[PDB]
Paper text:
Hexameric [name] rings act as the replicative DNA helicase, encircling the leading strand DNA template at the replication fork. Mcm2-7 complexes are loaded to encircle double-stranded DNA (dsDNA) via a ‘gate’ between Mcm2 and Mcm5 to yield a double hexamer that does not unwind DNA. During helicase activation, the Dbf4-dependent Cdc7 kinase (DDK) and cyclin-dependent kinases (CDKs) drive recruitment of Cdc45 and the GINS complex. These factors stimulate the Mcm2-7 ATPase and helicase and with Mcm2-7 form the CMG complex (Cdc45-Mcm2-7-GINS), the active replicative helicase. Following activation, two Mcm2-7 helicases encircle single-stranded DNA (ssDNA) and translocate independently, 3ʹ→5ʹ, on the leading strand DNA template with the ATPase domain leading.
We tested the DNA unwinding activity of PfMCMAAA to compare with that of the Sso-[name] chimera to explore interdomain communication. We found PfMCMAAA had a negligible unwinding activity. The inactivity of PfMCMAAA could result from attributes identified in the PfMCMAAA double-octamer crystal structure (see ‘Materials and methods’). Specifically, the non-hexameric ring architecture or the alternative topology for the helix-2-insert region, both of which we consider artifacts of the N-terminal truncation, could fully explain the lack of unwinding by this domain. Thus, although SsoMCMN does enhance the unwinding activity of PfMCMAAA, this could simply be due to enforcing a hexameric architecture or by disallowing the unusual h2i topology in favor of the canonical topology.
Author numbering:
A (entry chain A), B (entry chain B), C (entry chain O), D (entry chain P): 263 to 361, 729 to 746, 753 to 904, 919 to 965
The structure:
């Protein structure tokens, strides 16, 4: 509770929104959106069921697909080292690290890739999952409920976790013209489950490279650099678990008008009505991220920003 | 019986017909007919056998086929949460929810998709039923009697339930010109079993979209909104089970003339004499829906209205 | 309804109770109790479930075990020719007769011996059932619910029928001193399921034999004799199906005292608290048999009479 | 919250403790302890984990083993109709009733007997579980965590439910001298998992029988009697779910002295140090049952009472 005191203070801050991303991964340089994306993903949408409106997921899934050597693997890793109930697990070898452990997890489930059925499961190399390990997630993302009835017994595991995953193209790189979506090795009906897909191509370019490298070296020498979180990870991890508890943003007519005015815009053009749902989740989380609990015109605004970005990137 | 008192009063109401639909699914916006359709389906036709006129089904089956993201899945779900003996079960995973349970069902049968052989079985994704799970229904809709003689034993299960199902095109979407009936993945001799098929395409259009979205948000925030039943679901569920008991509408010469005058109209034009039978069921149920028990010119009138609609929608 | 008129009149009759038995099997001579037993069995106990008092079977099962040539086979047969939904099926050969058929049965199930899962299944030669065909009944009598999950599928059939069965001793005859219950080839935990077991030994004796024979010949010559029902079987079959509908006897404090005063008596002495339950079923049915719907001191009285008889017969 | 108001008031009541049991099963007559036992079991022990003191189960398991016709089956059933997340499932046939359903359960798991991995699983006939269905529970009671790794995948289901089960002797009845514990068909290392085992033998005796019967009849006639809960089940079910939320009894030095003073007593004599743990759970729950949250000398007192009873019954 001495902590709750601090948190409120942080939120008070003017730039909190920005500070929170600059703390996701201080190491990796850039990727403001892929950071502000994961950021929301870690705060999640409202997720509050009603009887009349049955179930109501709020968890925000995020896919990271790109050419090799773009920091995907790296990034996920940094998230594990931050996110509370984080499970990193790359399609390669057996068993995984991630966790900072404390007598195991608070509630149910576990498995092969290693998912806690809550908790965010950072799945690197989702395109190299043995069709089995894939299937499960596919169900988990789709249904929101896994199930194993191998034997006379029938086991229905309740899936309630967030998935921040990475993935490479079926080819490795995809710079070609063809759509980034034919190049991924995942069944489209799975991809459609992510609320945001960051496509990461990598032209050469001097400027950026110079920056990126100079940056690596910097935060690569000794055991310290002026390149560490803008917010302590222990604080920021409490701050998260906190907002995913006491805050449940309600949509301001203010915002409402902004998101619909857009969904319709978005419609004019592989869009469905789902795009609207996920957009809602982002803007809800963007509020929770700062504790509101009112998705103001700004929140909703920001949400669409990030989304029209994920989108632009698809044109490559 | 303190209840029966209320019911009669409701029926007394001038707009009951309308109130009853605005209570099917207050959530989903629009689809007056797909609502007033399901409405009848929940009240069913006369269904009263005679020795001379052998068997006499009255149950009204309803199929909902459309492009994705049109509320099919959603809708069925809301029906389960209303309909008395409702069983929702979407072709995906194992076991299903629906029921509000009370020491199981009043009479016989059960199975794989999960049907109670009475009770309405809301079958979402009927186009993704394993050829086995399909077969059964096919028989159930066709015969009105299932059967399993796997072993020396022979089991003939009496099928007496209503089927309100959904389904997607073999392609996913079907906006093309080709007939909506070549695009469905169900054997025509099954489809022919539905008394009403609502074809749901989805052009974009601003107006409607704006409405739909604005609506979602509305009844999507907090745990309450001015968007709940025009009639309490507990009352309306008793009202149903009641009319499917004490009311057995007889056809008024009044109406008779209206439905035949039409069937013949309908004939001029993939129509049979079955179309006449089902039309009869609707108009009978539309009365029962308000308790008559006389299919007045209005009832019969309404019936054909809904039917010439289901029809218009086929031209797409 | 022109029928309902007659029925009420019959009940009005002073001797109805007696008339009803003299109509079970006019052929077979004697066995007043085995007749008045089956009689009750055909009318069944209350059988009305409550939420607080969960399930509530009322069906009365009856076992007939005796030396050969005592009319068991015969009797069951006559019952099939009377009882509404009757299924006769003797452990021998394949398929069975019984039914008077009419487009099959009103509700679910069917099988190997041939049972309709309602309807009374007259099972002759229950001691010669292939351990399989036995098992089922055993479950059916015990659970009140059968089940076949042979394959990936799981089938739980609701068992709701009456069982009036016959059976011979493991030896054929049992005149010996040893208890009639060690001589039957059925698992005691099955036998315990019957509400009445009529043990039929057959000493020679002139008097009785003379009667029995003289009787056979009588109702054995030509195609007619003064030995036909005291009540038309078509009437009496409606009368049954009627009382198993409109009558649901409630226990009069009057009777209550009689049955408990006895159960306790019965206790002093292979008795349990189940004996009390079944006794309750008889007395309830004995009322329904005449339509009450109040288990008067007489009904309850009669019930124990029949029961202390089934009992005396066990001493042989 | 209008409810929370009532609850507090009930607790205020002087006799609440007693009222709460007289509401478990008003039907079945007697068994004050088997009622006050189940009562505690429904309120559970503290169950609050710490890092230093690792895991900390609080759920109270209860076994009911006795001769047939003692109300075991019946009782469990009444509990299902009360307990919030209750699952009744008797080793017989397939699928089970219990639940009052509401879009399925709040959290994870499901299976063969049918358990929700929280919620109390009322398992009647635990001695007739197919060695498979047993195993699971055995693990569930022992580990507190189930697991299915059938295939490449590995599924660890978190077991966090209460088990109120019944069971018959390997012989059926056991009146003999031999210890009730050799007569049960369960592996001793399973039985040791129950916090209370009620052994139910059934001598005849007139007095009691007269009572029992008279009672049955009473609450067996019509659809009503002065034999219904001393507390409404809807209230009492909220009251439970409430105390299993806001109350977490701490042990008063007051009580502490009472339970240890006894454990040691208990030691003098198949006792371990586990007996102490479970005793602690009862007394904790007995407080929670009335909301304390301080296990006063009385609570602890009561706990040992019930326990020295379960014990006396073992001498038979
Ligand atoms: N934008 C970036 N910022 C910082 N480091 C980067 C960046 N892009 C690539 N790197 C470097 O690449 C390495 C990680 O490559 P990696 O993420 O594992 O490729 P992939 O995502 O395809 O598995 C790191 O050691 C890091 O120094
Ligand atoms: N007409 C509508 N009214 C209200 N919501 C709608 C409507 N159409 C689509 N939706 C939205 O779409 C979502 C449901 O899509 P869904 O019914 O599952 O597609 P499908 O029927 O193909 O499975 C809901 O969350 C809902 O908000
Ligand atoms: N009490 C009886 N009344 C009339 N006929 C009887 C009687 N007992 C035996 N019978 C005669 O026995 C024959 C039937 O024997 P049955 O019932 O088949 O022996 P079981 O019961 O062991 O199969 C009938 O033809 C009938 O004439
Ligand atoms: N103590 C009792 N109080 C009330 N009814 C009882 C009692 N004991 C036995 N019964 C009767 O026994 C029947 C239930 O027997 P049951 O519980 O199913 O035996 P078991 O527990 O071995 O399965 C009920 O219908 C009930 O009337
Ligand atoms: Mg990589
Ligand atoms: Mg769908
Ligand atoms: Mg024979
Ligand atoms: Mg039992």
């Amino acid at each position: 509770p001495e902590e709750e005191q601090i948190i409120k203070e942080l939120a008070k801050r003017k730039d909190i929104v920005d500070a929170i991303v600059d703390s996701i991964a201080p190491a990796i340089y850039g990727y403001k959106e892929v950071k502000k994306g994961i950021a929301l993903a870690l705060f999640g949408g409202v997720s509050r069921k009603l009887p009349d409106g049955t179930r109501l997921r709020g968890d925000i899934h995020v896919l990271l697909v790109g050419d090799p050597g773009v920091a995907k693997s790296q990034i996920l890793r940094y998230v594990a080292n931050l996110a509370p109930r984080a499970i990193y697990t790359s399609x390669x070898x057996x068993x995984x690290x991630x966790x900072x452990x404390x007598x195991x997890x608070x509630x149910x489930x576990x498995x092969x890739x290693x998912x806690x059925x809550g908790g965010y499961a950072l799945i690197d190399e989702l395109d190299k999952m043995s069709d089995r390990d894939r299937s499960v997630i596919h169900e988990a993302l789709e249904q929101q409920t896994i199930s194993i009835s191998k034997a006379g017994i029938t086991a229905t595991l309740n899936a309630r976790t967030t998935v921040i995953a990475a993935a490479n193209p079926k080819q490795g790189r995809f710079n070609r013209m063809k759509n980034p979506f034919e190049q991924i090795d995942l069944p489209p009906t799975l991809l459609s489950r992510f609320d945001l897909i960051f496509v990461l191509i990598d032209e050469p370019d001097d400027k950026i490279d110079s920056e990126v490298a100079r940056h690596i070296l910097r935060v690569r020498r000794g055991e310290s650099e002026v390149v560490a979180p803008k917010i302590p990870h222990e604080i920021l991890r409490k701050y998260i678990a906190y907002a995913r508890k006491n805050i449940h943003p309600v949509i301001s007519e203010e915002a409402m008008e902004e998101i619909e005015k857009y969904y319709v815009r978005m419609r004019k053009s592989p869009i469905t009505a789902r795009q609207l749902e996920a957009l809602i989740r982002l803007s809800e989380a963007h509020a929770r991220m700062r504790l509101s609990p009112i998705v103001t015109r700004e929140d909703a605004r920001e949400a669409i920003k990030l989304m029209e970005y994920t989108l632009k990137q698809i044109a490559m």
